[PDB]
Design a protein around this motif. Structure first.
Motif, PDB file in Angstrom:
ATOM      1  N   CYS A 111       0.810  -1.244   0.007  1.00  0.00           N
ATOM      2  CA  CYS A 111      -0.067  -0.056  -0.142  1.00  0.00           C
ATOM      3  C   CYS A 111       0.990   1.218   0.020  1.00  0.00           C
ATOM      4  O   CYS A 111       1.833   1.240   0.817  1.00  0.00           O
ATOM      5  CB  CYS A 111      -0.836  -0.102   1.175  1.00  0.00           C
TER       6      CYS A 111
ATOM      7  N   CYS B  74      -0.287   3.177   3.646  1.00  0.00           N
ATOM      8  CA  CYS B  74       0.060   2.779   5.194  1.00  0.00           C
ATOM      9  C   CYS B  74       1.343   1.892   4.994  1.00  0.00           C
ATOM     10  O   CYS B  74       1.880   1.486   6.118  1.00  0.00           O
ATOM     11  CB  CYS B  74      -1.184   2.005   5.441  1.00  0.00           C
TER      12      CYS B  74
ATOM     13  N   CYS C 156      -7.116  -1.808   0.071  1.00  0.00           N
ATOM     14  CA  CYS C 156      -6.255  -2.347   1.179  1.00  0.00           C
ATOM     15  C   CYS C 156      -6.894  -2.876   2.388  1.00  0.00           C
ATOM     16  O   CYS C 156      -7.934  -2.197   3.002  1.00  0.00           O
ATOM     17  CB  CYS C 156      -5.213  -1.011   1.658  1.00  0.00           C
TER      18      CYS C 156
ATOM     19  N   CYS D  78      -5.676  -0.384   5.969  1.00  0.00           N
ATOM     20  CA  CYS D  78      -6.212   0.779   6.078  1.00  0.00           C
ATOM     21  C   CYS D  78      -7.484   1.155   5.434  1.00  0.00           C
ATOM     22  O   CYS D  78      -7.875   2.349   5.539  1.00  0.00           O
ATOM     23  CB  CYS D  78      -5.189   1.978   5.487  1.00  0.00           C
TER      24      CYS D  78
HETATM   25 ZN   LIG Z   1      -3.116   0.649   3.102  1.00  0.00          ZN
END
Ligand SMILES: [Zn+2]
Lengths: 84, 191, 59, 95, 91
Positions: free
Chosen positions: E38, E41, E56, E59
């Motif tokens: 990601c 994050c 994701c 997050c």
């Molecule tokens: Zn993420």
RNA sequence: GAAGCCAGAGGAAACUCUGGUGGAGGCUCGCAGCGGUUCUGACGUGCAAAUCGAUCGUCAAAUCUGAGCAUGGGGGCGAAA
RNA sequence: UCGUGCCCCGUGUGGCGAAAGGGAAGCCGGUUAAUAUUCCGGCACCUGGAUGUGGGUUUUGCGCGGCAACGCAACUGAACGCGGAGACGACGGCGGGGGCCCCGGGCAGAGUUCUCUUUUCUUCUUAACGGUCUAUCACCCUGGAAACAGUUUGUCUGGAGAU
RNA sequence: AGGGAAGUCGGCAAAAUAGAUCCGUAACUUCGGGAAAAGGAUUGGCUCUAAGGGUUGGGCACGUGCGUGCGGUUAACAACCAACUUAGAACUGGUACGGACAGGGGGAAUCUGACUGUCUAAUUAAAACAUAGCAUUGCG
RNA sequence: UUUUUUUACUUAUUCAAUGAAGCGGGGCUGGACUUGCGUCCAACUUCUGGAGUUAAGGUCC
């Protein structure tokens, strides 16, 4: 039977505010106040005024719905319209 | 399918400044290869908010602020009139006339290239995905970037069922019977 | 419709946005609101300083 | 240069890695430097900046991600923000 | 312990559809089923939800991307020349 | 018994080998269901204006199916006979 | 009260269309020649309305407690808004619960019995509605992890705070 | 019975094979398959043996059943409880041991359609149709 | 006065959008060039997945 809806019976049917009564009779406010004085229609007080009208305040005036229905048949209404 | 994929209607804010919206969802649209973005804007005239449905450009994400108007920045996801962009900028959902809420470069992986400006008569020369050249009014809006979902047609369908699933939500005619496989009463190629 | 038959404290949590938003999201809302308003005051102060500098340069 | 300075600080001085320990260091007031990674969420970044503004602690915005910041600290895990409490032999505070 | 020598993920198709078509579909399947790091994050938890949509798991951020990869080389080049054009326009 | 995963043995690494794990596929044997290949089959004023027996195809899906609704003869619908 | 007016708001437009979709609420026992979640008995529930009593709150006017997740019988809330529920595919293995199936002991009844069989079989049940104590996920607090750890049949999780 | 396709346009029909454990398995190949290829060994009953599990439970010093500060990883031990698989061995009946039932005959090739799928309800299920793939044309 | 050509216009006709919301022309302010004051061009929100609604207020009565 079919489930009743809220606010369709009881005090909400028993009382009307002055604004509702004036619109119901299709009068001006001076004529309505004059007619209420002459026919003895008196202010009333519900137990819970929110059950009648959610925008009501302490200065809101209430009347009996049956009293307004009775005022619908008074011959002075046609006299008012004839004079206008 | 819930809502059509259109811009906001062209109003005072987009004509003279910019308005900010927030991307809340990126969703799949059946029958369309490109994902859609739900963006919430403020109404300038009332308290209630307005939800719009855009075709999502690549790189847009949930929680992102996008900007639509004349003075919006040259950033992916922002909606600007073509007069506010330099030459060589690629855009998507380009309006043919200002206020038609977008017509050109809408499918996945496609875009419209701003080739030139003629500021005297207020025109903009653009290049379409088919390679055609066009002249549009310079106040026509477009979203900066490329439509998301590119490379979809690179993968083979490989199966009659996958073709069937593709076309059943699209209403296109499938399966297809050849004209030469028909009787002469059915097709001119029949027989 | 069964929520119409139970009392208010059973349908909510005694906190702002209780029964509609969770505690982590409420904390995020509070911190974000405070920080964004502080940044707005900072930007207003910087804009006033720039305006005063521009007025002094013009005068 | 910042990577070599971070390695020297890890070798000689004292640090704490992570958001909660960084907040605890800022509250204690013994934090000398705060490093915030590039991909840190902007709300947490603004909160860390506000805490450092209250505590009069300098903030360095690390240009790498939390993965790169963890690697630069010499760890095998990610680190979104970190606090230097003792510079040790490095000159990272003089900048 | 490699179980197939070349078909890999295309072994589910058996002997059908042709060797070249199985090889062509294999690259898209591998990229579209891989996990990605990601960019918000930093965790390795981004997976494809639908075509062009990458989510994701940690997050909960959802991003519009390519059909079978999270990012498209044309889109990356677009971002680069867009940043150049933005610098030229602002300066 | 496909990806993914674990361990052991190698290999500078990339990778290779071995044993497991896992449970993919318009994959496969096959019950119901759906269909309808074969038989000098039964029946041939029949149980039946298309039925009966054995055998056979398919059986996790381009599978089977109800109700509601749409398309009407210069038409419709048609994986096209 | 210049008494026969004035103000606010914007979204449109009605109806039909499902005894398998959505949806307020009822269980058990008995009863007839023939109906029964419909009758009878007992024990409940939902929706709507009116108006009392107790209890609560208030002289710091609209409760208190817990660091927190949140709790507790109450504990004001119009316009205008936000959100949730209604509200959702197919397939695979894994875990919990009910019911059924299976095994053992015991009371009672029945069958077998030339011989054998402390034997074979049958009854041994507990509704809706409530109270109370508990039940995976998840969330909160302390604290800060490499000699990485936790952990599923299935390799996911953790300085964005794991054990 | 004996012969074993001499029958017939034609092995039509029937017969033969068949479950499970183990040994083993060619060409060709799109490397996935072919494959249950092919070809073999075995299977009853009885009496045993072995392997594969669950739960509970540790010594001091004080305060007084919990709190500490310790001390130890042979609990590698005891007590209780429990079910189905797998392997090995002896003995024993036999014309039969998947004893009924259930249940692939196999192989060498040629033509043909890529495959899964679909149609002539009531004479044709197929090299027909569809299919993925490929190519062309029109449209801003 | 009429016949052709192109070359403007808008009032018929035609298309599209909107909850028919900010069009056209000035004034105010700032910036530029110009001429020594006419043009054109700008007013207003960009670190953050918050909130924005019942006019606060000034001044005459
Ligand atoms: Zn993420």
């Amino acid at each position: 039977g079919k489930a009743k809806k809220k606010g369709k019976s009881g005090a909400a049917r028993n009382y009307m505010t002055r604004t509702q009564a004036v619109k119901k009779l299709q009068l001006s406010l001076p004529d309505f106040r004059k007619l209420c004085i002459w026919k003895g229609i008196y202010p009333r007080e519900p137990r819970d005024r929110r059950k009648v009208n959610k925008s009501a305040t302490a200065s809101t005036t209430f009347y009996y719905t049956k009293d307004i229905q009775y005022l619908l048949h008074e011959p002075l209404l046609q006299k008012f319209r004839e004079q206008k | 399918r819930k809502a059509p994929a259109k811009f906001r209607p062209l109003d005072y804010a987009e004509r003279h400044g910019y308005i900010r919206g927030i991307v809340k969802e990126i969703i799949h649209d059946p029958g369309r290869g490109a994902p859609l973005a739900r963006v919430v804007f403020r109404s300038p005239y009332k308290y209630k908010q307005i939800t719009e449905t855009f075709i999502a450009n690549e790189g847009m994400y949930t929680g992102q602020f996008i900007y639509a108007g004349k003075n919006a920045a040259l950033t992916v996801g922002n909606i600007l009139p073509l007069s506010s962009v330099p030459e060589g900028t690629v855009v998507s959902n380009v309006e043919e006339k200002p206020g038609d809420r977008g017509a050109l470069g809408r499918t996945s992986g496609n875009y419209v290239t701003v080739v030139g400006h003629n500021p005297d008569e207020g025109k903009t020369r653009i290049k379409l995905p088919s390679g055609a050249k066009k002249v549009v009014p310079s106040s026509s809006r477009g979203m900066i970037g490329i439509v998301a979902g590119g490379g979809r047609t690179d993968k083979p369908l490989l199966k009659a069922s996958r073709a069937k699933h593709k076309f059943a939500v699209k209403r296109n005619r499938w399966p297809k019977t050849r004209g030469v496989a028909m009787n002469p009463v059915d097709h001119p190629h029949g027989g | 419709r069964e929520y119409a038959t139970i009392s208010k404290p059973k349908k909510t949590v005694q906190r702002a946005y209780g029964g509609s938003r969770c505690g982590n999201c409420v904390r995020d809302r509070i911190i974000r609101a405070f920080l964004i308003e502080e940044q707005k005051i900072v930007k207003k102060v910087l804009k006033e300083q720039s305006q005063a500098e521009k007025k002094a340069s013009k005068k | 240069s910042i990577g070599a300075k971070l390695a020297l600080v890890i070798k000689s001085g004292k640090v704490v890695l992570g958001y909660r320990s960084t907040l605890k260091a800022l509250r204690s007031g013994k934090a000398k430097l705060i490093l915030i990674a590039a991909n840190t969420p902007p709300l947490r970044k603004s909160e860390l900046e506000y805490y450092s503004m209250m505590s009069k602690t300098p903030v360095h915005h690390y240009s790498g991600t939390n993965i790169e910041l963890g690697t630069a600290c010499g760890k095998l895990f990610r680190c979104s923000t970190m606090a230097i409490l003792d510079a040790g032999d490095s000159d990272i505070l003089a900048d | 312990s490699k179980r197939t020598k070349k078909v890999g993920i295309s072994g589910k198709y058996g002997t059908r559809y042709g060797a070249s078509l199985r090889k062509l579909v294999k690259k898209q399947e591998v990229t579209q089923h891989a996990r990605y790091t990601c960019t918000f994050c930093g965790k390795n938890s981004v997976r494809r939800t639908a075509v062009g949509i990458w989510s994701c798991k940690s997050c909960k951020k959802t991003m519009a991307g390519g059909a079978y990869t999270v990012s498209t080389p044309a889109a990356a080049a677009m971002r680069s020349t867009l940043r150049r054009l933005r610098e030229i326009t602002e300066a």
